Design a protein around this ligand. Structure first.
Ligand SMILES: CC(C)Oc1cc(C(=O)N2CCN(C)CC2)ccc1NC(=O)c1csc(-c2cccc(NC(=O)Nc3ccccc3)c2)n1
Length: 298
């Protein structure tokens, strides 16, 4: 994995866009290109090595590192976090079923890559919309890993944590595999389809959500959701990791559903005035899906 050595003189820092845990992410410029830089010593060696080994369109690009001061240099995500597109400050952008399905397809392709690496696979173990970034007018999605928490107080048991998207076996303290990322992906699918924060009904501190998920609570089912999308979604939620699909299988299934979801290449340009009403209604609209389905199967 080749990598550019960067003299800190060449960087011109523009703004700060994330301060949590083990560094401060910042917008900057470098040889024309807009870049994102994370300033910090220990695990940096492992991350820098991993972040150079990866080469996939749906995982964020590493241009290189500056060894003094010790910081990563990567492509800037103009579109920002998916979380911020979904639930950020107003005005939030309008999006479609096709966008929602494409973002989950793209995320799954990135994760399938991570799980297929050799000799050992990379397990992300922290997939959630804050670590999913958007580019190309919101059309393209790239996985990253900010790693938002460490201290139990002002991180892991709060809104800057990740218990809503976490697999039971991880927070349970049991052994886990790459199937933990499949659970997370299942939750993200529900999230983009509904534009609801998962387990916002429960809330409180994170241990309340962990308690509910450990007993078997899942996000509510979605009204009028196609059965194949509901099958794939609810399988990823499975308590037993053995019953969850592989990311390889998800990529195949999703790749073929996109036939019934044209228009994902349309960039995010229209505004939205979003307000929230057993089951729950989707934000996106599945009417054209059923229409195109009927034509193929009829
Ligand atoms: C809050 C941040 C996250 O996410 C961002 C949020 C915004 C944002 O919300 N803004 C607010 C201001 N407005 C004006 C624009 C929108 C902007 C940029 C980034 N970040 C990035 O562009 C970026 C690119 S790489 C990266 C990053 C940051 C920290 C760590 C890593 N590391 C990895 O990706 N590691 C890794 C990935 C896969 C496998 C192994 C390691 C990347 N961040």
């Amino acid at each position: 994995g080749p990598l550019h050595m960067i003299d800190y003189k060449e960087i011109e820092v523009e703004e700060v866009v994330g301060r949590g845990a083990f560094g401060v992410v910042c917008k900057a410029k470098w040889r024309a290109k807009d870049v994102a830089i994370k300033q910090i010593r220990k695990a940096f060696i492992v991350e820098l090595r991993q972040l150079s080994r990866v080469n996939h369109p749906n995982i964020v690009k590493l241009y290189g590192a500056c060894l003094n001061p010790v910081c990563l240099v990567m492509e800037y995500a103009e579109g920002g976090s998916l979380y911020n597109v979904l639930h950020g400050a107003e005005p939030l952008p309008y999006y479609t079923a096709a966008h929602a399905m494409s973002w989950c397809l793209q995320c799954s392709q990135g994760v399938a890559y991570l799980h297929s690496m050799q000799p050992k696979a990379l397990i992300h173990r922290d997939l959630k919309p804050p670590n999913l970034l958007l580019v190309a007018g919101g059309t393209v999605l790239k996985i990253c890993d900010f790693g938002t928490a460490c201290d139990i107080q002002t991180h892991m048991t709060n809104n800057k944590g990740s218990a809503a998207w976490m697999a039971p076996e991880v927070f349970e303290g049991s052994n886990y595999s790459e199937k933990c990322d499949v659970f997370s992906w299942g939750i993200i699918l529900w999230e983009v389809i509904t534009r609801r924060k998962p387990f916002d009904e429960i809330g409180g501190p994170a241990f309340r959500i962990m308690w509910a998920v450990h007993n078997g609570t899942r996000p509510p089912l979605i009204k009028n959701l196609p059965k194949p999308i509901e099958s794939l979604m609810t399988r990823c939620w499975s308590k037993d990791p053995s019953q969850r699909p592989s990311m390889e299988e998800i990529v195949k299934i999703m790749t073929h559903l996109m036939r019934y979801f044209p228009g994902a290449d349309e960039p995010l340009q229209y505004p939205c005035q979003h307000s929230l009403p057993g089951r729950v209604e989707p934000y996106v609209d599945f009417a054209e899906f059923y229409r195109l389905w009927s034509v193929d199967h009829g």
